[PDB]
């Protein structure tokens, strides 16, 4: 293992070959999950891009966080998307937290602590256990077929995800930076492979 | 009974079948009342919707809180409405408190603690005792005949109503979240039935 505390991944150039692949000890299919992270880039105002690609052999888009220019954040699961609009975008590092549950189909999204209205999406579904998780490039196949126009340029870090919805109390604690015990992906005990031009550097954001 | 403290009702999908029905031990016709609540949705900028439907057999609109796009808040009593404008609408949870009195006909409305100018409406009237109270769907009949275009999507909670006007002191205390003793509807000792897809979840707002 490794500890990335106060460190982050940097993609400086637009390409279709640089990417970071993560590994998880997950064995059981998921019925509910949450994922939090922090990222910083300026392509927001030029073109869309992916943020966190969780793909399975049966689905290139099992879970996907995307940004669409003039649209906002697109949270997709099981090949279906939900949109959260953003009339205008600021230029600064942003921390987000998204959660989904199969039992009811409720979706929660949080940006900078402020929650967004809940929504319903793909009730009763299940998520495959074995999967490939990638940062930097969108997936249209099982770990391949990347698109340059869907790549990400900038910094990313503080990648974590549990396998059960968190109460608002807990989300606020995560933003404040208190202690926590991630279950599926631990930024403090993480495993990763890298390809292409990707660097590890001290984080910009506090 | 039940205690909903730190919990709220969620309607995730637009429909004409989901709704929550409340019950009150009220026996005497009302000569004055107040009602406060907290709610969160984003349909504000798309179409109007109801918030709290209190209907009687003789009147589908005995008491009604409505939002009209580009107009604002519409407080209706005895089938007649009064308007409070809002040039622009923010996107965040909102807490409101409205009061009416039959003796004089004065109306008070409070949003986020800031009071609005008083107005006169239906002086000398009385309100029927037996009634049906609904959250989620507007009423055009005694507990039926809902309209999809008048439904509500989002979260609602902290539903309470006395049967006498409250002094500004008291309204400020209610917003600060201090202790209080509701008379007609107690969020802490509430009774409710549910229909359709409605969920109970921890509240978003502080």
């Amino acid at each position, epitope marked *: 293992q490794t500890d990335m505390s106060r460190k982050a991944f940097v993609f400086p150039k637009e390409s279709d070959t640089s990417y970071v692949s993560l590994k998880a000890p997950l064995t059981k299919p998921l019925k509910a999950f949450t994922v939090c992270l922090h990222f910083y880039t300026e392509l927001s105002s030029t073109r869309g891009y992916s943020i966190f690609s969780y793909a399975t052999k049966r689905q*290139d*888009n099992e879970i996907l966080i995307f940004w*669409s220019k003039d649209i906002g954040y*697109s949270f997709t699961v099981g*090949g*279906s*998307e939900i949109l959260f609009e953003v009339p205008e975008v600021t230029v600064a590092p942003v921390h987000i937290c998204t959660s989904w549950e199969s039992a009811s189909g409720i979706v929660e999204f949080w940006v900078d602590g402020k929650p967004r209205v809940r929504k319903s999406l793909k009730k009763g579904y299940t998520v495959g256990a074995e999967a490939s998780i990638i940062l930097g490039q*969108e997936q249209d196949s099982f770990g391949g077929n990347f698109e340059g126009s869907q790549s990400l340029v900038g910094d990313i870090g503080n990648v974590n995800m549990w396998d059960f919805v968190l109460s608002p109390d807990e989300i606020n604690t995560i933003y404040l930076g208190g202690p926590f015990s991630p279950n599926v992906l631990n930024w403090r005990a993480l495993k990763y492979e890298v390809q292409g031009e990707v660097f590890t550097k001290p984080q910009l954001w506090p | 009974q039940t205690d909903m403290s730190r919990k709220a009702f969620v309607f995730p999908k*637009e429909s004409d079948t989901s709704y929550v029905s409340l019950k009150a031990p009220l026996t005497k016709p009302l000569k004055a009342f107040t009602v406060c609540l907290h709610f969160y949705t984003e349909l504000s900028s798309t179409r109007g919707y109801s918030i709290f439907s209190y209907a009687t057999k003789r009147q589908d609109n005995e008491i009604l809180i409505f939002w009209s796009k580009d107009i604002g808040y519409s407080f209706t009593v005895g089938g007649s409405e009064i308007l409070f404008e809002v040039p622009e609408v923010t996107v965040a949870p909102v807490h409101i408190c409205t009061s009416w009195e039959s003796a004089s006909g004065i109306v008070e409305f409070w949003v986020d603690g800031k009071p609005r100018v008083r107005k006169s409406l239906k002086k000398g009237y009385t309100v029927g005792a037996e009634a049906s109270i609904i959250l989620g769907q507007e009423q055009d009949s005694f507990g039926g005949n809902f309209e999809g275009s008048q439904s509500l999507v989002g979260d609602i909670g902290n539903v309470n109503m006395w049967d006498f006007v409250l002094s500004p002191d008291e309204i400020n205390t209610i917003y600060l979240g201090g202790p209080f003793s509701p008379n007609v509807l107690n969020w802490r000792a509430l009774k409710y039935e549910v229909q359709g897809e409605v969920f109970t979840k921890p509240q978003l707002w502080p």
Partner: nanobody
Amino acid sequence: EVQLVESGGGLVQAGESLRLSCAASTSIFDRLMGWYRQAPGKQRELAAFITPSGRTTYADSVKGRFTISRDNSVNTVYLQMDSLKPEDTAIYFCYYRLNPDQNYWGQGTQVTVSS
């Protein structure tokens, strides 16, 4: 599957306007709609689309000329083009948003704007 069905196209001269439309067999309360046109020889180019919230986006060329509208009540979207000109003539395709990789397409309708 979404049974998209568009209509409102044919033969028109330059300097006119047309209000085409399309409808779907499912609620459009959340998905966004758009339009693609394809000129003879080139690919499918975006023209305009409208989000579920109501925000609208228009292609640069047709900026200030076209206009899109939506109606949840009947599950139908509309596009009105004004001051039609011959170069805008092309095959117009319907759009149904889906996962970012994928998207539904309609049969498309030819609109030939002569002089």
